[PDB]
């Protein structure tokens, strides 16, 4: 029984690596796209050009809740989501941190002010020649997209992702599959979310 | 007995194979993403002075690149992170030929850089006008050494080999003597036809 259990633990550890890599790739690639956009856009930014870019970047990319451009004040000035009212994001932690650090920020999860759904965001400050922040690129990723990705590959195993405060980010599978099991866990690269993959129990065969 | 520890050594070679393939696949995917976002963000028609600055900013602090270049439709290098001594034309390169014909991103096999003289592989992204004619090319050359050092840094003590589809050695990490009497766990990368072979460690006295 110890031998099958050990196979099951190794399998869980394989899934842990597989699924974290998928998420790390999505996050990393998005950081790289937003960074390249911030570098290549011609100053001063033409807002209709930026709107076109965001739409083209968004197109056929289910990972995104939306892509947005903000002015120095945090007003959303371009948006893949058709906005019904003016939106300002200056109060968001990621915005406060991006402004302060003048570096890319990857936020914890929260409920989108624009769509009402759970997202997390990658924010890249756009700088002028004097290193002053003039604008912000914001890529909002849909948490549910990540969850569904994992669940489709691994429907029969219980996987949890939680943040440092212990907030559930998402959970995939039936928690019952986890009974009497200790999980195999590990953090993501760009955000301190911890993924826990529970090994499946040893069945009657044996 | 032995067979049980050998099975563990094999599983860890498999873990390493996936770790390292994931790393290189990410590097290639991220670089493609950076180049495609660049072509989308920049004003058209492309201004060569602005492209030159963008390439320098992209290249700066990126050990991965041998160099970044922009080619005109004839294959002349028109922007370059590498100081050029004479005119350079890459129209004879296989990747250029395939990029021109397919009008899609191409990833090349390894070769010796005409510009730096070092072993590299390149990622080439054609730039198209409104009517889908190819007018220019973005070229990102990555140093093989960078990949080799990347693998070595993670796994000094195990023998790993990367060979292309024809059996040409791309690079090896570690001492070949560690592979003696072992069968490798192997797999191809995603976007380039290189096969990575990770040899498990021998069973020790313990």
Curated annotation (Swiss-Prot), chain B:
Function: Phosphorylates the sporulation-regulatory protein spo0F and, to a minor extent, is responsible for heterogeneous expression of spo0A during logarithmical growth. Also phosphorylates spo0A under biofilm growth conditions.
Induction remark: Expressed during growth and early stationary phase.
Knocked-out gene: effects: Cells lacking this gene sporulate normally in spo0F mutants.
Name of the protein in its database record: Sporulation kinase D
Cell compartments where the protein resides: Cell membrane
Gene expressing this chain: kinD
Assembly and interaction partners: Oligomerizes, probably forms homodimers; oligomerization is assisted by FloT. Interacts with FloT.
């Amino acid at each position: 029984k110890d031998t099958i259990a050990a196979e099951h633990k190794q399998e869980a550890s394989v899934l842990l690596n597989l699924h974290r890599n998928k998420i790390n790739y999505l996050i990393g690639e998005t950081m790289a796209r937003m960074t390249s956009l911030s570098i290549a856009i011609d100053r001063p930014v033409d807002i209709k050009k930026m709107q076109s870019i965001l739409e083209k970047t968004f197109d056929s990319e289910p990972r995104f809740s939306g892509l947005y451009f903000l002015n120095a004040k945090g007003d959303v000035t371009a948006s893949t989501t058709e906005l019904k009212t003016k939106v300002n994001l200056a109060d968001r932690s990621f915005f406060i941190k991006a402004k302060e650090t003048k570096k890319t920020v990857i936020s914890d999860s929260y409920s989108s002010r624009i769509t009402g759904q759970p997202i997390f965001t990658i924010c890249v400050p756009v700088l002028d020649s004097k290193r002053n922040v003039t604008d912000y690129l914001v890529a909002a990723i849909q948490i549910d997209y990540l969850k569904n990705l994992i669940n489709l590959l691994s429907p029969d195993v219980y996987i949890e992702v939680v943040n440092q405060d212990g907030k559930m980010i998402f959970a995939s599978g039936q928690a019952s599959h986890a009974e009497d099991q200790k999980p195999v866990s590990g953090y993501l690269d760009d955000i301190s979310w911890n993924m826990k993959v529970y090994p499946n129990p040893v069945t009657i065969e044996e």
